[PDB]
Amino acid sequence: XXXXXXXXXXXXXXXXXXXXXXXXXXXXXXXXXXXXXXXXXXXXXXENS
Amino acid sequence: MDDQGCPRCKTTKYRNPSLKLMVNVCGHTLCESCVDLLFVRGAGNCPECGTPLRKSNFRVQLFEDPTVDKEVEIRKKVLKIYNKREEDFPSLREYNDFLEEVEEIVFNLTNNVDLDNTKKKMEIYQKENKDVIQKNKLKLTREQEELEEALEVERQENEQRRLFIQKEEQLQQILKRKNKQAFLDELESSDLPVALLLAQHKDRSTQLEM
Amino acid sequence: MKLNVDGLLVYFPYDYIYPEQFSYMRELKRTLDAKGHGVLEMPSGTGKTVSLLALIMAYQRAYPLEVTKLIYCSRTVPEIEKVIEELRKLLNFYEKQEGEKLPFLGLALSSRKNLCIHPEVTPLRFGKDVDGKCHSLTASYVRAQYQHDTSLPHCRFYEEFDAHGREVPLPAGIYNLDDLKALGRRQGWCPYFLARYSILHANVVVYSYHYLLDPKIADLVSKELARKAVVVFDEAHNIDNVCIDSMSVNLTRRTLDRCQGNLETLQKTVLRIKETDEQRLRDEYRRLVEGXXXXXXXXXXXXXXXXXXXXXXXXXXXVPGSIRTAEHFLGFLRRLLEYVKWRLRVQHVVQESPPAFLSGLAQRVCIQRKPLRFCAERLRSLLHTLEITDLADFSPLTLLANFATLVSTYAKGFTIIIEPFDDRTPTIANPILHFSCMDASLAIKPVFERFQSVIITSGTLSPLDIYPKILDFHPVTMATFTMTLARVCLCPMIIGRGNDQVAISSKFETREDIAVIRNYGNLLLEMSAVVPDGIVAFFTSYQYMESTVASWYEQGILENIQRNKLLFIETQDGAETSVALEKYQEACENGRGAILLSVARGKVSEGIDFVHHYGRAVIMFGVPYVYTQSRILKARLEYLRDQFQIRENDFLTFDAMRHAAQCVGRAIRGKTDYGLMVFADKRFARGDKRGKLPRWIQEHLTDANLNLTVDEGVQVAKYFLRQMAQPFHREDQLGLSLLSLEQLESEETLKRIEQIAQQL
């Protein structure tokens, strides 16, 4: 799976479906509004399941 | 509240995040437990650099840099004086240079010789304690008073907005319920054709809402 | 097709139109006669981009006075590519009709992620690191050191563009990002700086929202261009959300710890450069005292970071206070950092207005207001001064400095809200600090001041009564265009009734109710057994999709959905979503059945569009309410009660319906596309929530379809698909839902197009 995500990518990311870079100006969690999107904390048992 | 930990009597900041640190003349660190444990064992002897504390020379604040505490306290004691606003100078460059002179005096009292600094303070403090320093004490007191008044005016307006929208909701709810119960007690005990009385009820509802 | 749109010839790049098309063209002639803004609503049926670019090119071909430049603004980079290639189709039609008498400089423009060449910058994956290495390899000072030596680092692209490339404008060629990169490869240039330098010569420029509405990026379209410019936003539902994302600032404890490390690093840099040099610091003190920090600002191309986040009209022209010596400015930032760090220590949620925070500052750490305004100018000038290379390392402190500017500029409209812990966190050490804004209007205000006529346009916008009531906005045209059809083309049903006659809802507020999730799974199963070729299923929140697809496994449902079609569940990775989308589109074409279930908020439904056979049945699970978010919602609603006049229960319903009908109305491309679009819970039938879906979906929402069961909805789906899988050829459209050349010149058709379009 990590080879499909890292060593490989989306082949038809040519004009659509490129979900990583479907935003021209992506920044860190600093100067935004919805910066609490992916939390490095809060890893539970049932949620990880 | 998660700093490296109290030096002498190391328990406070590591366990309790409910404290504050007090600085000394030399300016390093002392917590309340340090304060009391130090006062019982000398009352004015720095825990590390042994500076000769003049008289009880401790000040409790909440920051985690000693130079920050030093600059804050010295900056307050300097900006009690040197109160010439932009209103008080003729030009703008003189006001900005005056603020830079204040920064120079604060950094000189940080580390340099405190003699020429105190002589400069003597000259300016005398020459402007004649007129301007007390005048600006008065004006800053006026602006503090009016800012506290304006914040209380803001909070009165917010409480009135909350309570008036609550009374809007309760007035319309009780009033619509009394409209409906009155219309039922008038369908009972009157003698009219039905469509006219129901149109009067719908007129009551629309004149109530709209 | 040579349209007469009551004043002008228009070369439409197809030899057929819709009537909706020509109604849109009438109303946009109306908006460009009188210099006013106007909000349109063409649904997703027509080529609204095709029409839009056609008429703006007709005006620019016919009137070189009022309209200088079109600035299109579509939000995602694949839509940038789509609008550029439709403009390229229209230029190819335009040059088929006449010959090579074009001159017309179409131009895309995004960023250094998408226009950088250099094979050491290119393998970086992130925007700030590409910006940092581009700041390394070219600058105002590294470029000069290379200019009087040989082996110092340089790009060879920006240097060769500096050698010759700033005297030859790009001749009349419509350029994508790929074509522009290829021209940068060809002669050997930066196409990034070529694009920015060739903004001045274009006629259509197509960039994103944040490249226009951000005050700290959009310093590249000047006033004199803007006085005769026509800006056209596209897909403009979340304009207010873009503004609130564009001026609010988030501070975190990690940001402040890395700010402390930054402060110590810059202190050491000031010490060693004090051991090195003194003369340019004299020149610093000169250009602070003499000027207003504009001495070396003339040659400033890659020495510009993100500018001051105050707007264009609230900036000053004075001298920065007591700040001048960089030692004292490090003390200034030290004081501000320690006070904001102490303010963040409070272990309960605290809301303040920014003058209360300024007074708490100006009393307890002696920092006044005007040296707190000029902190952005000071940190940008200082950070230009000390020759330091990789500015990504200095991302927090600049943030903090920029935060200072906002605290010292705006009041009564914005709000400083401190959270010791987030909503989904509780009691984990994340104290954050939203300087949140809630004036939507204060970010589009220079967009209405500068520009001539900005045209908000989307396929869904409803109701149109509220976008003047939020954006401080008074348009010429408030238009809604009715879907005129010769074939039903869509059916919305409101499946708000379980098969056990259980009321389907999401009233529980993401804390699972079992039988409702059971009936959702039963809906998805039986709709899988009916619908072809890909079903799209939007949930409410990723916690709720998480919990639902959890309890579709322990309960025995999800293997049956596997038996009918192939699932592709969503995750909040940027690359895993793209792989799931790619396999979902390779399973709608290699025979089997594919079903993409996502969240109705994220990026899955913002740009990534589902066309003829990729989504046949858009299943909108639930009513999407923003339920996780904090007192930012309560505070923006208190604001819209107070200083605008928009109710609580009005704005919540408006926001929920713009998200729901945003995610639903992507399934349909043209008249020869059919999309089942179901709404699954009872609340979409309650009059106000149904009343705020757009008109072109309420027109086809029948009272019988209102509050169907699961199985009644399944039988309506079967009858829908069977009546709408037959040969619906072009000969069934020339009467009603299509127009020829000679079907336009009849005045009876003109009466029809008068009857179609309406205004609000």
Ligand code: SF4
């Ligand atoms: S100067 Fe041009 S080639 Fe060099 S990093 Fe920047 S965009 Fe890339």
Ligand SMILES: [Zn+2]
């Ligand atoms: Zn102690």
Ligand SMILES: [Zn+2]
């Ligand atoms: Zn000491």
